[PDB]
Amino acid sequence: DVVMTQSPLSLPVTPGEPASISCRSSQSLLHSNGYNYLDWYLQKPGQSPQLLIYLGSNRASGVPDRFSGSGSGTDFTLKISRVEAEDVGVYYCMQSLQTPRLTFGPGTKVDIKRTVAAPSVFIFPPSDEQLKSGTASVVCLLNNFYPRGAKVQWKVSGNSQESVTEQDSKDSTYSLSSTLTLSKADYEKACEVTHQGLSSPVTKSF
Amino acid sequence: MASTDSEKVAEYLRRATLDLRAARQRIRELEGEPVAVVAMACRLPGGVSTPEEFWELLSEGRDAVAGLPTDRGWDLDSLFHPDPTRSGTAHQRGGGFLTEATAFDPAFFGMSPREALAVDPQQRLMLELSWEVLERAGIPPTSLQASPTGVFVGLIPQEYGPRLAEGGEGVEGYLMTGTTTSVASGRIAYTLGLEGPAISVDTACSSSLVAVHLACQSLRRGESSLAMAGGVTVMPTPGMLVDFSRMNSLAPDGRCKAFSAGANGFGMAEGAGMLLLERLSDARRNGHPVLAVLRGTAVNSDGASNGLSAPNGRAQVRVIQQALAESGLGPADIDAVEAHGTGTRLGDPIEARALFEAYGRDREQPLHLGSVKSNLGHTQAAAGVAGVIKMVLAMRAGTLPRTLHASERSKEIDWSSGAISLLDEPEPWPAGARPRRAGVSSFGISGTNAHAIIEEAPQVVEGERVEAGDVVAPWVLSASSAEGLRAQAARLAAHLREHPGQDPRDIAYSLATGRAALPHRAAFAPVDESAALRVLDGLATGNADGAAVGTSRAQQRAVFVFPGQGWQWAGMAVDLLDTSPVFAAALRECADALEPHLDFEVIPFLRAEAARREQDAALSTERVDVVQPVMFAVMVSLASMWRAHGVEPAAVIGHSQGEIAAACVAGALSLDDAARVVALRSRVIATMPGNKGMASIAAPAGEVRARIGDRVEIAAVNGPRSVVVAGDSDELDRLVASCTTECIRAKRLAVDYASHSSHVETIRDALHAELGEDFHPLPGFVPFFSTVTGRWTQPDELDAGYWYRNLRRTVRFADAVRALAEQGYRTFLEVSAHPILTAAIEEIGDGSGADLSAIHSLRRGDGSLADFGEALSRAFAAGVAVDWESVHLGTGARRVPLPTYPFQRERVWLEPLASLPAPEREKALFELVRSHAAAVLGHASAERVPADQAFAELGVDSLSALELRNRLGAATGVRLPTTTVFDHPDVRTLAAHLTSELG
Amino acid sequence: LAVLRGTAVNSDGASNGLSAPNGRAQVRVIQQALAESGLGPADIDAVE
Amino acid sequence: EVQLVQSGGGLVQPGRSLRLSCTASGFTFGDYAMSWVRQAPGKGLEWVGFIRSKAYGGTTEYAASVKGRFTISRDDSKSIAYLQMNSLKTEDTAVYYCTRGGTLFDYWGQGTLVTVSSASTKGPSVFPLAPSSAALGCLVKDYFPEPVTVSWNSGALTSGVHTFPAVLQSSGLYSLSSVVTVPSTYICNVNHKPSNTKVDKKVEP
Amino acid sequence: EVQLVQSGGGLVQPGRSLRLSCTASGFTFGDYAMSWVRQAPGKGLEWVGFIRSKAYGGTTEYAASVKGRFTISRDDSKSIAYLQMNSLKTEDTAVYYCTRGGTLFDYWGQGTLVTVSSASTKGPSVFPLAPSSAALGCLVKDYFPEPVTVSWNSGALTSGVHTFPAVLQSSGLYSLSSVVTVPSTYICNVNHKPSNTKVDKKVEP
Ligand SMILES: *P(=O)(O)OCC(C)(C)[C@H](O)C(=O)NCCC(=O)NCCS
C-alpha cells in the first residue's frame, strides 16, 4: 500500500525556544540500506519551499544548523534548537519509500506563539447598496484570535466561504472572514464561534 | 514507479556529495581562504609617503638612513658621548626617520588641535594612513559607517610628553588618549565609524605582521568583512636609541646591513604601514581592487632561547613551515623570501639558517632573499608590513628589488648550498605559469616569530571592455579646508601631468566613487585633458574658472523646485534629447502620454529654433494650448534625468504649472494622469486670450498691495524683490510707463493669460468639466509643499479642485521656500530649460536665515551634455549629494590610482556685561563665544575656527565642551545647560541662543 | 572549569566621543557572541 | 549559484493549451530528473509529475488526474524543461513549481501563478460594512484577476488596517473585504490594476 | 573512532582449517558488507570474498578459485565477522585484510599474516659472501618462519648496511642475504627467534 503519514499540524513556536516537530508513518521508512528515507521540507509564507533535511537526519547545504533531524523507522523528529522568523511557515514530512507522490500531506502549520487571544466577533449586515444587484453577504469578523481553530456557524450553514488571514509581527494574531454570499428572498429570514478563547457560544445577529 | 533503488539513492548520493562539495569549500574558505590586499598606505623612512613613492626608493637602490630628526626637539648632544656606557647616550649616528610625523591635520578629523597635540605621533600617522588606504582602494572613507571593519594596528609603547602624573598645561585630559596604544586602533574606528574589531597588536618587530595575521583570521572567520591591518613605529623620543645602545645592539651608522659581513648592529628606523585586507571572494565580488593576496600567515614564539632578545632557529623554521602548511604551499612555491634581516651579525646568521632549513633544504630555483630594512632600516612594528608593501610593489611592477649593503655576503652563513641568492641586484621577476608567490618574515624582540605568504593576485582582472561615450562625467573633488581644496586639484593635476593617458571617465569614476564628500567641493565637467588640467591649474590657485566651488557642510538632501514660465526660447531640449538616452526616452513617454488628450507630439516641435515660430507669424511659444504640454514634457524629462543621475528630491515646489510635475515625479500622479491634467488644463487656460496678462516685477510687496486694482493684483510672491502681478490691459502698460523711470523695471512676460486671480473661475464651469475624476489623488514618493496654501501638506490632496485652487490664490512661492529653509532643507534644484528666478531665492536666503544654493540644470541656449555635466558639478559643489554609482552605472569606467587627501599638516608636537546696545552685541557675543571656543580648543591662533562646523567635528568632546560652557557661564555669567554642546551643535547656534537668553 | 562557547569583539564606531560608549554597538557585540556560540538570549541566566 | 528560472504565466480558459518553461543554471541539466509540483490556493504542495533523467531513459510519470495532457519534456542543448499544459480545467488554477529531482525537490525555483478562470476583467463593486454600533470596513467583491491593494484613509492609517486574502467563488470571481478596528468617518479606496478602476467609499452605520 | 581489529594468525599445513576474526568498533556492523582481501607477497591486493549486509540478504560471494571452501559469516549481537579458511593452500600463505564494504573498502583494518607452509622451524645456515677483490656479505638461507633481524658489526655499523627481504623457495624455506658496501674483517650475526638460534660469521675473500 502507501505509507500515509501524520504530524502535529498546529505546533506552536516562540522566539528563543527549542521546538520539537514530529512525523509518524504507518510503515517503516528504514530501508535495507539502514538509512531512514524521510525528508523534512520548509515552505516560507508566500515563498518557494526549501529542502531542510534529507535521509532523516542530515542537512541540506545552505540550511542553517538550527534544524536537526532524528528518529526511528516509524517516528521521526526535527528539533529547532532556536526558532526565528525564518523558521516559520509549513513543515512537510516526505516519505521516499513509494513515489507516486499524490499530495504533500496536511503539513505542520507553524506560528509564533503568544498567549490565548480574545476573539472579537463583529457582525456586519450587508449594505443596502449591495441589495440592488441581487446579492447579499453578511460578514462575521473574527478579529485578534489565536489559534486558528474556530468554526463559524450560520443559523436562523453551508453557504459560508472561508477567508483565513495573515498572522502578523506586532500582534501575532489571526483574523477570519466567513463570507455568507446570499440571494434576494432568503435574506429576510446570526454568527457564533467555538474558539478556545471563550467557552460559551457568543451569538450576535445582524 | 521510481526505478526502485536506482533513481533515489543515486539522487540522494548527488546531494550527500554536493553538500559535501559545499561543506568542504566552507572549510577551505574558513581556513585557507586567500584574502586580498585591497590598498596600500605607507609613511616610511625618507621621502616615502605613498606606496608608489616607495618603489623609486626601492628599485633604484636608495637608502633611507640619513640622520636623527631635529623636528622633535631631541637633545642630540647628550645622545652622543665618547663613553659608550654613559646613561642617556645613543650609539647610532643616524637612521631612517620620518620628516612628517611631527606634523598633523587636526581640523581634518573630529580632533581638537590640543587633543591632536596630545595624540601619540603613532596614532596621528595611523589615522592619515587609514584615510589614504581607504582613498587608494576606491572606497569612500565616509561610506564605512557602522560597518564591520576591523582595525589591527601593530605598535611600540613610546614615551611622548610629560609624565601622566604631572599632567600638562593644556594637555590634561587628552594625554592618555594619545599615549595609549589602546586607542591606537579605536581612534581609527571612531573617526571612520568602523564597527569591526579595533585590536592593537604589540609584539615589537613583528607586530604589524602579527597584526595582519589576526586581520587575515578575522577575514577567514567572517567576523569582519574588511580589515585595516598594519603597524607603526614612530619615535617621538630617543629613548630606545639610548636603551638599545646599552645592550650594544644598534649599528653606529643606523643602517641595517642585512646578511652582510660589515654589519655592526641592527640599526633603527621609524615608519608606518597599512594594508586594506579583504577576502578574495568579497574583494572581487564588491569590485575592490586586488593588489596582491595574503594566502597564509603563521605566528609563533621563539620559546626558551638564549635570552629574551636572542632569536631561535627551530621556532623560526617552524613558523615559516606553518605559514606554508596553512597556505597549502611548499618551499619551492615561494619565489622570493623577504625575511626580517634585522641587520646585526648575530640575528642574520641564525635567521639565514632557518631560511635554508624551511626553504633551501628543498629548492628547485635559488630563493631570492631580500630585506626592506636594508633600504629603510629596522622599522620594528612597521616591519612585517613594510616588507609586504615591498613585495606587493614588486609584483605590481614585476621586479625583485635590491638589498642594500649586501655585496659582501656574511661569512658566518653557509651560502655554499646555492638555494638562497641574496638580492644584491635587481632580478627580473615577471609574471609566468607559476603563481608568483613569496614570503615575509618578522622576528620581534619579544620572541614572537611570524611569517606571512603573499601570492600574486590571480590575473583575472584582464578582460575589461573598451568603449567611448559623450557623457562628460564631472571631475569632483573635496577637502576639509579651502587650502586643501586648492591642494587636491594641484596634486591631481600633477598626477595627470606625470601619469598621462588616463581616460577622463576613469578619472571621474575614481574621483567620484573613492573620495569622501568633504566640506569644500570643487567640480567641473571636462571636455579634454587640456581643458581639465587648466581648470585644475586655476583651482590650485583658487580661481573658479569653468568649475563650481562651494563650502557645503551640513548639507546632504536636495529640494526640487519647478519654475513656471520664463524659458520662451525652448530651443534647448533638442540637444539634450539628441545626446541623452534618458531625455530621449522619458520625453517620448510623457509625449505619448500627452498625445491621447492633446494631439501635439512634442517631437516635431522639439527639432526647431526659437525663431522657428516667428517665421510662421507666431510669437516665441505664445499659444498656451501648444506651450503648456511642452514645458510639462521637458520638465518631467529633466526631473527624470536628475533622478536618474542619483539626485532624488526631498521637497517639491511648483510655481504655476510645476504642480503638475509635482503630481508626476513625486508619485502623486502617473505620467498619463499628470499629462492628461496639463493637456486638459492648457485647453481651458487658452480660452482666456484677451487683454489678460501678468507682469513680473521687483516692485515691493507692501506697495503693490496698495497698487492692487484695475483687475491687476498679485498672482505670485517669488521672493522679497520678486512679485508676479496678474491683470488686464488697464494697469498693464502704465505700470511699465510709470516704473521704468525710477530704477524699477517691470518684466512684462510675453503671456496672454492671467492666473492666481479671480479670472480663472470664469472658466470654473469648463475647468471642472474638462478635467474629469480619473487622475485619482495618490500618496506618492516625495514630500511636497503646496503653493496654494503655502504649507507642507499630504501627497493625497490632488484633484481637479486642487488645480483650480492653485490657479486661484497667490502662489506664495517666497513663503514656500522660507518654510523650506525652516524645515531643515537648504538646497534647491531649479529643474527647467532656463533658470528664471535664480536670483530670487538667493534674495530669499540673503534676507532671511542662511544663504541658499541655487542649482540649475540648463540655461537659455545651453542644452548640450557639457552643460548638464556642469549642472551636476554645481549641484555637488553646492552640497547636493549626487549618487555617483548612477552617473557611472555604466560608461566603461574603471578604478584608477589617484593621489590621496593632501593633509594640510601643521607642527603639533608635545615635548616632555553687554547692556543690550545693538546687534553689535550679537556680533560681540558671537566673537566672545568663538574666542572662548578657540581657547578650549587649543587653537593658539585664535583667529578663526569654522563657523559652519559643528561642536563634534572641531573636537569639542567633554573636556572642551564642559570648559567652554564654564567659560561662558563666567564671562556672560549664565547657567548654560549641561548638554548645551548637544543642544546647540554650532557656534552660530550657541551664540544665537546666548544672545537670545537676555532675560 | 567552564567552557567558553562564544566570544565577540566589536568597535563602538562613530560614537559621541572617544571614551563615550555606543548604545547600538554593544547590542551587536552581545549578539555576535550570541550567534557565534549558537545560543539564544533566553539561555544566559546571569550577565557580568 | 543555481537557479531554476520559470516562465509561462498568462490567461487560459477551460480547454486551452499552455507552456511552462524552466531554465536551470548552475549544474548539468541531464542527470537531474525534472518534476512539476503544484500549489493549490489555501494549502501546500501536490506533485504533478516527473520525467526521468536523460540517461535514465527519460520516461515520464504524472498523476492519474493530469496523465497525458500535462506532457513533460526536457533538453540539455538549450537546457530547458517544458510542461505543456493541455485542457487546463478550473482545478489547474494554481502556483506551479519546477522541482530539481524526481524524489529530491531541491531548489523549487520561483513559482509561476497560472490562472484558469472563465471570468472577465472588470473593476470592483465596493460595498461598505456599516458597523453595528467597533470596526469599519468595506467590500471589494466582484473583481478579477488578482492584482489588488486596498488601504484605509488612503495610505494614512496603517495600524489596525488588515486586508483579507482573496476568496474564489464558484462563479470564478474574487472576494476581498478590507476592515479597520478603531473607535471613531473612514474612507477606503480600491484600485483595480488590469482595467484601472479606482473606487472610493466613505462609511457610516 | 573506527577500528577493524583482526585476529587468526598461526601455523597451518596444506589441508587444514583456520579462523579469521574481524571485530568492528565505531559504527553499526549490520549495514556494511564485509569483505576479505588478501596481499600475496611481492604484489598488491587480490579480493577473496565478501558477504552482503544483513538486511541486503547476507548473500556471500567469493572468488571462483576460493568459492565453497572459504565461509564468510558475520553477526551483530557480538559484532564479529568470520572468514572460515578451510583447506589452506600455498596461495593462502599471504597477508589478509578485513575490508569495510563489498564495493567500498574503507578502513582495511590492520592485516593478518597467515602462513601456509610445509617446512619446520630450524635456525639459519649462515654462508658468507666472499668479495671478488667491494662489498662484504653473508647468507641467512635455510630458515623459517619470518621473524628476522640481521645487522653488521653487531649493531655498530648502520651506514651501507642493507638486509635483503625474504625469498620463498619452492621447498618452503626462506632466503636472506644481508649486505654491506664499504672498502676494508666484518662480522655478521643472525638471530633466529622461534628456535633461538644465533649464528655469527667473519668473512674474508
Ligand atoms: P563626557 O561627558 O563624554 O565625559 C567623558 C567621560 C570619560 C567622562 C565619559 O563621560 C564616560 O564616562 N565614558 C564611560 C567610559 C566607557 O564608555 N567605558 C568604560 C571604559 S573605562
Automatic annotation (TrEMBL), chain B:
Superkingdom in the source lineage: Bacteria
Annotated ranges, domain Carrier: 923-994
Domain Ketosynthase family 3 (KS3): from-to ranges: 32-456
Transmembrane segments: none
Role of this protein: Involved in the biosynthesis of antibiotic erythromycin via the biosynthesis of its aglycone precursor, 6-deoxyerythronolide B (6-dEB).
Subunit record text: Homodimer. Erythronolide synthase is composed of EryAI, EryAII and EryAIII multimodular (2 modules) polypeptides each coding for a functional synthase subunit which participates in 2 of the six FAS-like elongation steps required for formation of the polyketide. Module 1, 2, 3, 4, 5, and 6 participating in biosynthesis steps 1, 2, 3, 4, 5, and 6, respectively.
Protein name per the record: 6-deoxyerythronolide-B synthase
Organism field: Saccharopolyspora erythraea
Name of the encoding gene: eryAI
Covered range of the whole protein: 557 to 2010 of 3545
